[PDB]
Amino acid sequence: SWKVKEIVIMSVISIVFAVVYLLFTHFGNVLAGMFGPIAYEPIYGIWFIVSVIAAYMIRKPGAALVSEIIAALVECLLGNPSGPMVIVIGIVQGLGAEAVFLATRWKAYSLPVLMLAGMGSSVASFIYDLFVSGYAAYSPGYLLIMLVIRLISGALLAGLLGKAVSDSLAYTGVLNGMALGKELKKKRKRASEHASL
Ligand SMILES: Cc1ncc(C[n+]2csc(CCO)c2C)c(N)n1
């Protein structure tokens, strides 16, 4: 059962990373223009990181989905050049990540599950692009290479990097009200019990 503070902290994270998303979107446009779509595939997973952060921190159903929606909304508001369609891909990416936490009953937050969640967004956004972003015009080889790159980027820049960011925050103390903060507390109590006089 969600707490007010969790809903609130999830929003602040979404908002902050909306700014990051927008910066990378600008990069991606320049890259696409110069070298074609494959050029932004390596950084693609950054646009999923909010889902992993919110889920790993809060560990309740809907975190991955809602956090990404809010981040996409705010990125749109801040001036994403593609307008509201970024909110659609945001919804799609959030559903892709959420599906992995659904599949593991919102009880599993090991790195492999976080990476899978990232990859879920990779797959969902790739489906979206085949409908909307002109990907259907490309060859099997090009598409296959881009999907593979996007899958790796989702695993690394959302899953792994998302865990690293979250852990770093947990170490500041600011997540002490959250599941991840509680986990750190438990681990620290365990480690403290090794002290001897
Ligand atoms: C929240 C969010 N913001 C920006 C992107 C970037 N983006 C939207 S569409 C498109 C081209 C088709 O892949 C790219 C690079 C994203 N994926 N998710």
Residue numbers in the entry: 3 to 199
Source paper text:
We determined the structure of a thiamine-bound group I substrate-capture (S) component (YkoE), an integral membrane protein that is part of a dedicated tripartite transporter complex, in a lipidic environment. The structure was solved using single-wavelength anomalous dispersion (SAD) with selenomethionine-labeled YkoE to 1.95 Å resolution. The structure of YkoE revealed a six helical transmembrane domain with the overall fold reminiscent of S components from group II ECF transporters (root-mean-square deviation between YkoE and other S components ranges between 2.6 and 3.6 Å). YkoE possesses an additional C-terminal helix that presumably protrudes toward the cytosol and lies perpendicular to the lipid bilayer. The six hydrophobic helices form a tight fold with an open cavity with a volume of 545 Å3 facing the extracellular part of the membrane. The thiamine molecule is present at the base of the cavity found in the extracellular part of the membrane. The pyrimidine group forms π-stacking interactions with a highly conserved Trp49 located at the kink of helix H2. In addition, the pyrimidine group is coordinated by H bonds by highly conserved Glu77 and Gln95 residues located on helix H3 and H4, respectively. The thiazole ring of thiamine forms H-bonding interactions with Asp131 and Tyr46. The thiamine-binding crevice in YkoE is open and not protected by lid closure mediated by loop L1 as observed for several group II ECF S components (Zhang et al., 2010, Erkens et al., 2011, Zhao et al., 2015).
